[PDB]
Structures are given as C-alpha cells and as structure tokens.
Amino acid sequence: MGIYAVMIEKMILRDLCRFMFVYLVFLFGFSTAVVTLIEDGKNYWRAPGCRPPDSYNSLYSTCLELFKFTIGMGDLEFTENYDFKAVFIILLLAYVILTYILLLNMLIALMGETVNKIAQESKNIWKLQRA
Amino acid sequence: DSVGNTVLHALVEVADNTADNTKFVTSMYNEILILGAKLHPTLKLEELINKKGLTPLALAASSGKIGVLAYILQREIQEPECRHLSRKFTEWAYGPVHSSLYDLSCIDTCEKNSVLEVIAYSSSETPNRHDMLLVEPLNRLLQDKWDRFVKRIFYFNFFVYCLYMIVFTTAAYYRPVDGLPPYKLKNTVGDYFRVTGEILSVSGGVYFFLRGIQYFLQRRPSMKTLFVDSYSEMLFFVQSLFMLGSVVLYFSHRKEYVASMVFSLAMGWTNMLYYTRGFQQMGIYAVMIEKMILRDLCRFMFVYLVFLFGFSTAVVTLIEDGKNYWRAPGCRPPDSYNSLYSTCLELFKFTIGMGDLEFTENYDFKAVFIILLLAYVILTYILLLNMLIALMGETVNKIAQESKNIWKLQRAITILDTEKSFLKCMRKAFRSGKLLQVGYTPDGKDDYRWCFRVDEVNWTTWNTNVGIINEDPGNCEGVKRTLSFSL
Amino acid sequence: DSVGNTVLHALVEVADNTADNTKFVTSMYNEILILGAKLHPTLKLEELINKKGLTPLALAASSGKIGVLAYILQREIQEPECRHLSRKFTEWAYGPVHSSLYDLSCIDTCEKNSVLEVIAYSSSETPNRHDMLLVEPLNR
Ligand SMILES: CCCCCCCC/C=C/CCCCCCCC(=O)O[C@@H](COC(=O)CCCCCCCCCCCCCCC)COP(=O)([O-])OCC[N+](C)(C)C
Ligand SMILES: CCCCCCCC/C=C/CCCCCCCC(=O)O[C@@H](COC(=O)CCCCCCCCCCCCCCC)COP(=O)([O-])OCC[N+](C)(C)C
Ligand SMILES: CCCCCCCC/C=C/CCCCCCCC(=O)O[C@@H](COC(=O)CCCCCCCCCCCCCCC)COP(=O)([O-])OCC[N+](C)(C)C
Ligand SMILES: CCCCCCCC/C=C/CCCCCCCC(=O)O[C@@H](COC(=O)CCCCCCCCCCCCCCC)COP(=O)([O-])OCC[N+](C)(C)C
Ligand SMILES: CCCCCCCC/C=C\CCCCCCCC(=O)O[C@@H](COC(=O)CCCCCCCCCCCCCCC)COP(=O)([O-])OCC[N+](C)(C)C
Ligand SMILES: CCCCCCCC/C=C\CCCCCCCC(=O)O[C@@H](COC(=O)CCCCCCCCCCCCCCC)COP(=O)([O-])OCC[N+](C)(C)C
Ligand SMILES: CCCCCCCC/C=C\CCCCCCCC(=O)O[C@@H](COC(=O)CCCCCCCCCCCCCCC)COP(=O)([O-])OCC[N+](C)(C)C
Ligand SMILES: [Cl-]
Ligand code: NA
C-alpha cells in the first residue's frame, strides 16, 4: 500500500500536472469560443428538455458544461441560444476529440509508461518514507 | 566532377550511416586531410564548395550523414604539421579534468551554410534530423544558446501571447450584440476599452499573417510536403486567416464575423501549446500529443467514422416518421429523429458516455434496433475506444526517446528563428568562442578560431596529450601558451 | 586544508559514483587506513571531522557518494594489526552458514551526525537518497 501511494504522488507531480495544464488550456480555450457564440435569450418559448431554462452566457457555466464532457455527462446540446448551429457543434466535436478522445486516453497511456519506469524507484522512495 | 564534388564531398555522399560504412569513410576522410596537408598545406580542403555551394561539413548536414557529421565536429588529429586540421582541441588537462575546445568555423549561424542552420531548416526528407543535434558540439551549443539571450526572449514571447489571448478573449466575450456588425462607438469607458481590445486583436492577426507570409515566401522556401512538415506555422497562419477573415466579414455587414472570430479564438488558445516547448518535460509532452494525433488519432477517427456513419445509416433506415398522429415525455425530446444528422449525433453520445440507448421509439422491429445499438457499443465503445488507449500505450513506449529528440529540434528552430529577428543579437550570438588561440597554422601564424569550451573528466585515461594549448589550467582572464607547439 | 578536509574526506568529495571512480577511491581509502594504522595506530582517522563537523562516513552520506558509503559500511580488512579497522566482521562460520556483524559506531541515531539520520533528512539536492538505504547494513 505504501508503494501504491508513492505512485499516486508520482502521478500527481509527473502526469497529472502535465495533463491539467494542457487540459485547462483546452477547457478555457473552447469554452471561451462557446460563450462568444452564444447570446442572451433574444426570443422574449421552448419545451423544457430536462428544464434548464438558463442564461448560459456566463463563462463559468460553459466551463462547467465543457467539464462534463470529461466526466461523461457532457450534454452536447446544452443550449440553443445561439446562431450558426454548425460552428457550435464543430467546437464541441473538436473539444471532445481533443480532450475526451485524445487527451484523457493519452493520460492513461502516459500513466502506463510511468508505472513501468518507477516500478523500482517507488519501492525505494517508500523505504525512505518509512525511514 | 560535373556536380562539383571534390574527394571529400564524394566521401560524404557515399556514406549511408551504417556501422561499417561510417568506420572507413571517416578513416578515409582523415587520411586525405593528412595527405592534403603534407602535399600542399596552403590549401584548406574543407572550404571547397560544390555547385550547390555546400562545404563537405555542410553536405553531411544537408543530407542525413550523421556518422560523417559526428566525426568532423569532433576531429582530433594527433600528428604534428596536421594538428591545425583538428576541430576538437584540449586547452588544459589537470589530472582527471580536462577542458575540450570545439571549433565553430562554419557552424554557429554567422556563416551562410552553417550546419546548425542546415540541420534545423531541413525539409524532413533528409534522415536523422532529430539525431544530428545529439552530436557533442551541437547539443551544448544550442543549450547554452538557450540558457542565455534566448530563454528570456522566448519567455517574453510567451508572455505577450498570453497577453494577446487575454485581450482577444475579453474583446470577444464583450462583443456587441445589438445589430449589424458595423457597431457605433458609444462614448463610454467600456466601449473605448472594447474597441481598443479589438484593434489589438486584429493587429495580432495581421502579425501572425505577416509572420506566416515571411515563412512561406521570404524565408524558408517550402515544398508541398513541407506544409505537412511544419504544423505549428500552419496553425498560427490558419488562426490569422480566421482572424483576418473575421474582419472581412465584419465590414461586409455580415453576422458571420462571430463564426470566424470563434474559430480564431479556439485555435488561438490551442496554439498556446506552441510555447510549451522550451520547458523540457512539457515540450516532450506536446510532441507526444502531436504523435498521438498523427499516428493514433488519425487511424482511430477513420475507423470510428466508418463505424459511426455505418450504424447511423442503419438506424435512420429503420426509424420512420411519427406515424401515430401520444407518449409521455421521458426527458421530453418529442422529435423527428428521421434526420441522418440527429442519429450521427445520438450515436456519438455513446462514445462520450451519454448514449441514450432508447433515444427514439418511432420505429418497428425493436429487436433489430437494439442489435444495431449493441453491435455499435461493442464495436466502438467496448472495442475501439479501449483499443485506442492500448495503441496509445504502445506509441508512448516507442517514441519515449524520439519525442525527446524531436523536442530538441523544436527548441533549435526557436533558437535560430530568434537570432534571425535581430542583426544586433547575431553579434551577441557568438556562443562563447572568445576568439581563442588553438595553436599555430602552417607558416607559423596564430590560429585564432571561435571555440566552444566543454569541460570533461576521465578517471581511467589521464590525458597526457601531445597538443595541449595552455600549460596553466583553467580560465581566469590570464593566459600562457605551451612550448610543445612545433611553431 | 582550509575546508578542514583530511585525506579521507578528499577521497569522498572526489568520487562521483561512477563504476571506474568507485573502484580506486575505495581502493585508495583502504590503503590509507592500512597506512594510517601502520604509521601510528593510536590515531583513528575516521573520527577526524572537517569544519562542517562531518566524519568521512558522514560526508559520504551527506553528499550522494553511495559507492564510498557501500564500502565503508561493509569494510573487511584481512591483514592482522589492521583487523580493527574493519566495519564488517564474522563471529562464527559453521560450514555454509556464517553470521556477519556490521559495526554501528557513528550510525544508529545515538550520535549527532549519524548517517542513517543524515541520509533520511537530506535536502533532496543530494543524489542517490533513495538508493543509499539499500546498502546492506542500512536496509536491515
Ligand atoms: C488546477 C488543478 C491542478 C491539479 C494538479 C496540481 C497538483 C499540485 C501541483 C503543483 C504545481 C506543479 C509543480 C509540482 C510540485 C513542485 C515541485 C517540482 O519540482 O515539480 C515536479 C517536477 O516534475 C516535472 O518537472 C514534470 C512536470 C512539469 C511541471 C508541469 C507544470 C504545468 C502546470 C502545473 C499546474 C497544473 C494546473 C495549473 C494550470 C495553469 C516534481 O517532480 P519531481 O519528481 O519532484 O522532480 C523531477 C525532476 N525532473 C524535473 C528532472 C524530472
Ligand atoms: C491581467 C490578469 C489576467 C487575469 C484575468 C483577466 C481580466 C478579466 C476581465 C477584465 C475586464 C472585464 C471586467 C469588467 C467588468 C464590467 C464590464 C462590463 O460588463 O460593462 C460593459 C462592457 O464593458 C466592456 O466592454 C469590458 C471591457 C473589454 C476590454 C477588452 C480588452 C481589454 C484590454 C484593453 C487594452 C489593454 C490595456 C489596458 C490594461 C489595463 C457592459 O457589458 P455588455 O457589453 O453590455 O454585456 C456583455 C454581455 N455578457 C457580459 C453577458 C457577455
Ligand atoms: C498576466 C497574465 C499572463 C500570465 C503570465 C504567464 C505566462 C508568461 C510566463 C513566463 C515565465 C514562465 C517560467 C516559469 C518557470 C521558471 C523557469 C525555470 O527555469 O524553471 C524550469 C521548470 O519549469 C517547469 O518545468 C514548469 C513547466 C511550465 C510550462 C507552462 C508554463 C506556465 C506559466 C504560467 C501559466 C501560463 C498562462 C496560461 C494562459 C493564461 C523550466 O526549465 P525546464 O526546461 O523545465 O528544466 C530545466 C531542465 N532540467 C530538468 C534538465 C533541469
Ligand atoms: C474528423 C476528425 C479527424 C481528427 C484527426 C485529424 C487530425 C489531422 C489529420 C490530417 C489528415 C491525416 C494525415 C496526417 C498528416 C499528414 C502528414 C503525414 O505524413 O501523415 C502521417 C503519417 O503517419 C501514418 O502514415 C500513419 C497513419 C495513417 C494515416 C491515417 C489516414 C486515415 C484518415 C485520416 C483522417 C481522419 C478523419 C477522416 C475520416 C475519413 C504523419 O506521420 P509522420 O510521423 O509525420 O510520418 C511517419 C512516417 N511513416 C509513414 C513511415 C510511419
Ligand atoms: C476544472 C475547471 C472547470 C470548472 C469551471 C471553473 C472555471 C472558472 C471560470 C471563470 C471564473 C468564474 C467567475 C466569472 C463568471 C461569472 C460572472 C460572469 O458572467 O462573468 C463576468 C466577468 O467577466 C469574465 O468572466 C471575464 C471576461 C473574459 C475572461 C478573461 C480571462 C483571461 C484569462 C485568465 C487566465 C485563465 C487561463 C487558464 C488556462 C490554463 C461578466 O459579467 P458582468 O457583466 O461583468 O457582471 C455584471 C456586473 N457588473 C456589470 C456590475 C460588473
Ligand atoms: C491582464 C491584462 C491584459 C491587458 C493588457 C495587455 C495589453 C497588450 C497585450 C497584447 C498586445 C498585442 C500584441 C500582438 C502581436 C502578436 C502577439 C504575439 O504573441 O506574437 C509575438 C509577440 O512578440 C512580440 O514581442 C511582438 C511585439 C509586440 C509589442 C510589444 C508588447 C510588449 C508589452 C508587454 C509589457 C509588459 C512587460 C514590460 C517589461 C517590464 C510572439 O509570437 P512568436 O513566438 O514570435 O511567433 C509565433 C510562433 N510561430 C513562429 C510558430 C508563428
Ligand atoms: C464526430 C461526428 C459525429 C457528429 C455528427 C455529424 C455527422 C453529419 C451527417 C450528415 C450531415 C448533416 C446534414 C444532413 C442532415 C440534415 C437534413 C436531412 O434530414 O437529410 C437530408 C439530406 O439527405 C442526406 O442527409 C443524405 C442521404 C444519405 C447519406 C449519403 C451520404 C454518402 C456518404 C458520404 C461520405 C461520408 C462517409 C464518412 C465515413 C468516414 C434529407 O432531407 P430532405 O428531405 O432532402 O430535406 C427536405 C428539403 N428538400 C426536399 C427541398 C430538399
Ligand atoms: Cl416535467
Ligand atoms: Na453519463
């Protein structure tokens, strides 16, 4: 168990820090482009599909709605208050491909390499932690 | 010959980097230099160019001849009257520690066909580009060109580009919404800052445009396969096309300016992954991101989109119109799913983790609808996504050394492109050569060659060398030459 | 010297853990102890400290000199009149099985610069911290 938590440390510092920089660059990058698309209500009207009648016009709401694609709860039709439905989906599809398909599955592969290379080192860091 | 190749050029174009071919070619390259000094010493054989203007060292860098390149840059010739042909010297040796000097005659960017510039600006058809910067002069030359006068320029370029994107975010977040895209300047302090952020946004879009034009035309005459070589300069140029295309759609009374400003905004933060080079563990990470897009995501998104468009065609063919014109609103999408776009969108949600699996009821034959969905989830979600993680697992193991070398080439292009920006910095870009004396020429004159200094140590070979430049060790702004020189 | 390093301290700060450097430094560290016993045996050379208060064994642990550390803790000297300089002894040997004794003079936490305390409380700029506890006294 102690070797296991030394490996947890070496995943936070080596693989999760390199992930959460490039992830938050992609998350804040595409969510900026989604808020810039979407306007206010402008039709003041729509059937409540799950009922969030919402001003998604905040940057915080869209960064929260693009984080849900990473979990597995990404709505992909989370608002309709925009124009140009084509460039809204092209933003979301380029986000899911870059982050969910590419960047998460790459994190699992890069955690796969690190386990192979710290398999002896994490035993020795643990013996220093016990010492 | 008719090509212009002399004897030393022909030894370069013969060698093909294998272990047996490197062994005698660099042995024959030595013996002809030694004969070239003994027969008539007034002629420097390596200054002779062919009809492409290449020296024999620049020819080894222009092609992928790494073994000839590793020999010339590290050439030590022990024989007196031939010591001046050496490109590696030692200036002192105090017991275990000795200080090596690598000559920087045609390399170090001050010349025209400098092999540091020739390697980094190659056209990717030449082999061993990533490995030619690992020879012992060229690695420490770029690293000490990085550690001073470049990393402060590169961190400044990464500071302005973050300040460029924060301005272009805020100018686009607070865009006007009232009407047609020529918007009147209301006399408020907010709309003054808003149009200030838009002028700074377009002026950056003009800048990355003009930086891309000078890459295409002025510097670096690019081939058609070189546009699929340099992915970064395309990505900054395509960003400036969406930014300048936004301005064209802005004044043309078209609301499609926001459709192009948004593509410049999402691609603009995606191009923040350019500047993550220069940080070593982050720069290797983004080279691996490149090799996952090109090698593993391209092979995935072909077979994925074949499976996605394949099963979604079979689902639309099943489902009809409403035909019952009735059902309780489970999440309330009462919808015509009879579009092909809606079903391709509903089968994409299985890949995310939001696949409904009962997304419509407007069909017949409920059995063959679920058998389509279950064969889709098994082929794509269970098989093809989990296989992508395994194939990304293999690629990481095989590019673990390669991505470190591609990064050092990515940093090397940054170091050379920084030096091209200033003619004043080129006189600062003499990398520590100090105009050092490395012995005497034939006719007995001072040699005075720009030499990069490398400290070394050996605990088995104690270096009682014939040619050692300084008799006093170290460097303390006080020099003393050795009397062991024939001249 | 001005640093306070004696001859055995200087052999520590010379060694840089490579395979060739470890080989003769621990060979030279032996021959000076053997000469240090034959010339005048009343002086214990490893008790001499520099101006940082480090012994030659504590200096090998304070820096990352694992090959000097692996030698001193396992030092067997076969020559009589120099057997007392050994840090590894055997107390009995019955056929195949023999029982080794590792001396714990400055190590085992009772002293001030105990090398078990020096290794574990290092400042992470020193190399081989995780590997210095794998030498045969310090692991067991
Ligand atoms: C918001 C959610 C965050 C979740 C994760 C945050 C968790 C806490 C993060 C805290 C801050 C990160 C620093 C870690 C601890 C500092 C000590 C150190 O030396 O660093 C590491 C160096 O390891 C590396 O050099 C490889 C990774 C590069 C650093 C990534 C920085 C990107 C942003 C990061 C921030 C991301 C978010 C910010 C986005 C803008 C420790 O590794 P080491 O084994 O001790 O030494 C290896 C020696 N080597 C360098 C020669 C190999
Ligand atoms: C540096 C640290 C980085 C970290 C964070 C970065 C800072 C973060 C934030 C920074 C500024 C935003 C906070 C202001 C809050 C009130 C504004 C407001 O809403 O009022 C008015 C707008 O007013 C504007 O137009 C906003 C100004 C836009 C300037 C764009 C370029 C900025 C740099 C210029 C040159 C630089 C040189 C000078 C530099 C000093 C009314 O708003 P509205 O238009 O009617 O409604 C929009 C609708 N929406 C809001 C729902 C979408
Ligand atoms: C006002 C608003 C603008 C904000 C300004 C911020 C941008 C402008 C700031 C520019 C200066 C940044 C320099 C910080 C590091 C110090 C230099 C150093 O030597 O450390 C080293 C460790 O560094 C790392 O390994 C961490 C990796 C960081 C990568 C991402 C940059 C984060 C900047 C903040 C977030 C970006 C913002 C994202 C978008 C907003 C780097 O060198 P090395 O090669 O790694 O190691 C040496 C090799 N060795 C291992 C063999 C020893
Ligand atoms: C829609 C979402 C797309 C998301 C991803 C798209 C991202 C951008 C895609 C851009 C287009 C794809 C080409 C990549 C760049 C061109 C340069 C090149 O040489 O190719 C690669 C060659 O690497 C390979 O040969 C292995 C992969 C085979 C290509 C897969 C094509 C399938 C469809 C693809 C389109 C999928 C979608 C279309 C479906 C109909 C570069 O690899 P290299 O390391 O430089 O050289 C290796 C040398 N080797 C060949 C000897 C090993
Ligand atoms: C895992 C993470 C995902 C989770 C989600 C968490 C994400 C958190 C995201 C955001 C923080 C949440 C707070 C803000 C949102 C609520 C209020 C709002 O609507 O916006 C307001 C502020 O305006 C802005 O939000 C800034 C405008 C553009 C952003 C520029 C940031 C620069 C990059 C910085 C570096 C980052 C780069 C990082 C890259 C590594 C605008 O509204 P208002 O009209 O001004 O208000 C009316 C009142 N008034 C008129 C009197 C003032
Ligand atoms: C929170 C507050 C926010 C609001 C305030 C912000 C207001 C104004 C904000 C941003 C202004 C917009 C600038 C647009 C120009 C393009 C931007 C860019 O990144 O390109 C270049 C900028 O490199 C340069 O330096 C070009 C000169 C810019 C003017 C100097 C600005 C210094 C201000 C700083 C003073 C502070 C420190 C002073 C020191 C004490 C760098 O890119 P590249 O690497 O050369 O090429 C790309 C890679 N490629 C080769 C693959 C294509
Ligand atoms: C990550 C990606 C997932 C995201 C989803 C994105 C997927 C995008 C998917 C589709 C694009 C979206 C636009 C079309 C749908 C909206 C309109 C409609 O209902 O269909 C209409 C068009 O008819 C068709 O759609 C074509 C019919 C069969 C498809 C043949 C394609 C051949 C393969 C090509 C190669 C592909 C192979 C690729 C394999 C690698 C039919 O309706 P209508 O009755 O004609 O309209 C009435 C008006 N009228 C009568 C006046 C005309
Ligand atoms: Cl309800
Ligand atoms: Na889900």
Find the helix packing angle between B386-398 and B298-318, rounded to 10°: 170
Q: Which of A13, A14, A15, A18 to mutate to probe the B interface, most B CBs <10 Å?
A: A18
In this structure, are residues B458 and B90 in contact, taking their beta carbons and an 8 Å threshold? Answer: no
Helices (H), A38-84: 59-71
Q: Is B97 helix (H, G, I), strand (E, B) or coil?
A: strand
Token reading at B429: 């870009």
**C-beta of residue C93 within 8 angstroms of C-beta of residue C45:** no
In this structure, the number of other CB atoms found within 10 A of the CB of residue B398 comes to: 11
Question: Nearest by CB to B354, which of A59, A76, A112?
Answer: A76
- H/E element, A5: helix A2-11
Nearest residue to B465 (alpha-carbon basis) of B89, B172, B129, B69: B89
Locus of tokens 């105990």: C114
- Whether A83 contacts B255, CB under 8 Å: yes
Structure tokens at A80: 């309709």
Whether C56 contacts C104, CB under 8 Å: no
Measured between alpha carbons, how far is B378 from B384 in angstroms, rounded to an integer? 8
Task: Take atom 32 of ligand 6 and give the residue whose Cα is closest.
Answer: B160
Between CA B161 and CA B2 the distance in angstroms is 50
Q: Using CA atoms, how far apart are residues B319 and B108, in angstroms rounded to an integer? A: 69
- C121: CA distance to ligand 8 center in Å? 63
- What is the C-alpha to C-alpha distance for residues C60 and C70, in angstroms, rounded to an integer? 9
| Among protein residues, the one whose CA lies closest to atom 44 of ligand 7 | B339
Measured in angstroms, the CA of C19 and the nearest CA of chain B are apart by 10
Q: Which residues of C touch B457 (CB under 8 A)?
A: 16
Under 8 Å CB pairs connecting chains A and B tally to: 135
- How far away is chain C from the Cα of B459, in angstroms, using its nearest Cα? 6
Measured in whole angstroms, how far is the alpha carbon of residue C120 from the centre of its chain? Answer: 17
Closest by Cα among C124, C120, C122, C113 to C139: C120
Decide if B74 contacts B82 (C-beta within 8 A): no
Calculate the alpha carbon distances from B434 to A120, B224, B422, B484 in Å: 46, 42, 21, 23
| Tokens describing residue C126 | 């020193």
A41 CA → ligand 7 middle, Å:
29
Helices (H), A17-104: 17-37, 59-71, 85-95
Which chain A residue is nearest to residue B272, measuring alpha carbons? A25
- Chain B CB contacts of A34 under 8 Å are 262
The span from the CA of B165 to the CA of B171, in Å, is 10
β-pair partners for B452: B102
The DSSP annotation for B260-315 comes to: HHHHHHHHHHHGGGSTTTTSHHHHHHHHHHHHHIIIIIHHHHHHHHHHHHHHHHHH
What is the rounded CA–CA span in Å between residue B93 and residue B97?
Answer: 6
Q: Considering only CB atoms, which chain A residues are within 8 Å of B269?
A: 25-26, 28-30, 32
Question: How far apart are the C-alpha atoms of B156 and B388, rounded to whole Å?
Answer: 38
- Any C CB within 8 A of B461 CB: no
**Token pair for B15:** 């060698």
Q: The dihedral of CA C39, C42, C47, C53: what is its sign?
A: negative
**Torsion sign over Cα C18, C19, C20, C21:** positive
Resolution (A): 3.2
Using a CB-CB cut-off of 8 Å, the residues of chain A touching C135 are none
Coil, strand, or helix at residue A76? coil
Q: How many residues appear in chain C? A: 140
> In chain A, what is the straight-line distance between the N-terminal and C-terminal CA atoms, in Å?
16
Question: Beta strands of B315-423 (E only): which ranges?
Answer: none
CB of A119 within 8 Å of a chain B CB? The answer is no
Q: C133 contacts in A (CB within 8 Å)?
A: 124, 127-128, 131
User: To test the ligand 1 pocket, which listed residue (B165, B269, B272, B281) has its Cβ within 8 A of the most ligand atoms?
Assistant: B281
User: If you measure from the C-alpha of residue C122 to the centroid of ligand 9, how many angstroms do you get, rounded to a whole number?
Assistant: 48
- Do residues B111 and B120 touch, judged by C-beta distance below 8 A? no
Nearest to A35 among B173, B282, B297 (CB): B173
In angstroms, the first-to-last Cα distance of chain C is 36
CB-CB contact of B86 with B150 (8 Å): no
CA distance between the termini of chain B:
36
What residues contact B283, with CB distance under 8 A and at least 6 apart? B276, B277, B407, B410, B411
Residue C88 CA to residue C103 CA, distance in Å, equals 6
Report how far residue A120's alpha carbon sits from residue C131's, in angstroms, rounded to the nearest whole number: 11
Burial of B187 (0-12, 13-18, 19+ CB in 10 A): exposed
Task: Answer whether A130 touches C (CB < 8 Å).
Answer: no
- The H or E element containing residue C99 is strand C97-102
Q: Are B42 and B30 in contact (CB under 8 A)?
A: no
Subunits with 3+ Cβ pairs within 8 Å of A are B, C
Token pair belonging to B265: 């905004």
The single-letter DSSP state of residue C40 is -
Q: How far apart are CA A122 and CA B382, in angstroms?
A: 32
Q: How far is C4 from chain A (nearest CA, A)?
A: 30
Structure tokens at B446: 């001072």
For residue B306 and ligand 4, the question of a CB distance below 6 A is answered with no
Which of C14-41 are b and which e, b meaning 16 or more Cβ less than 10 Å from the residue's Cβ? ebbbeeebbeebbeebbeebeebbeeee
Nearest CA residue ID for atom 33, ligand 1: A21
Q: Is B306 touching ligand 7 by the criterion CB < 6 Å?
A: yes
Q: Do A128 and C120 touch (CB under 8 A)?
A: yes
- Is B344 strand, coil or helix? helix
Give the residues across from B88 on adjacent strands: B102
Question: A80 C-alpha vs ligand 9 centroid, how far in Å?
Answer: 21
Please answer yes or no on whether A36 and B273 come within 8 Å at the CB atom: no
A101 lines ligand 4 (CB under 6 A): no
Residue numbers of C between 1 and 20 with CB closer than 8 Å to B:
16, 18, 20
Q: Tell me which H or E stretch contains B195.
A: helix B189-213
- Which ligand minimizes its atom distance to the CA of A72? 9
Pocket test for ligand 3, best of A15, A18, A19, A21 (most atoms within 8 A of CB): A21
Q: Is the separation of the CB atoms in C139 and A127 below 8 Å?
A: yes
Cα B277 to Cα B279: distance, rounded to the nearest angstrom: 5
Mutation pick for ligand 1 pocket among A6, A7, A10, A13 (CB with most ligand atoms within 8 Å): A13
Measure the CA–CA gap between A64 and A50, rounded to whole angstroms: 17
Cα A59 to middle of ligand 9, angstroms = 23
Encoded amino acid at C13, one letter: E
Closest C-alpha to B81, from B438, B440, B447:
B440
Question: From ligand 1's centre to the CA of B283, what distance in Å?
Answer: 14
Q: Give the whole-angstrom CA distance, residue B402 versus residue B179.
A: 53
For tokens 């700029």, what's the residue?
Answer: C125
**Residue B301 CB neighbour total at 10 angstroms:** 16
Q: Comparing C-alpha atoms, which of B285, B290, B284, B300 is closest to residue B390? A: B300
Any ligand 1 atom below 6 A from CB of A25: no
Cβ of C130 within 8 Å of Cβ of A131? The answer is: no
H-helix segments, B41-88? 56-62, 66-72
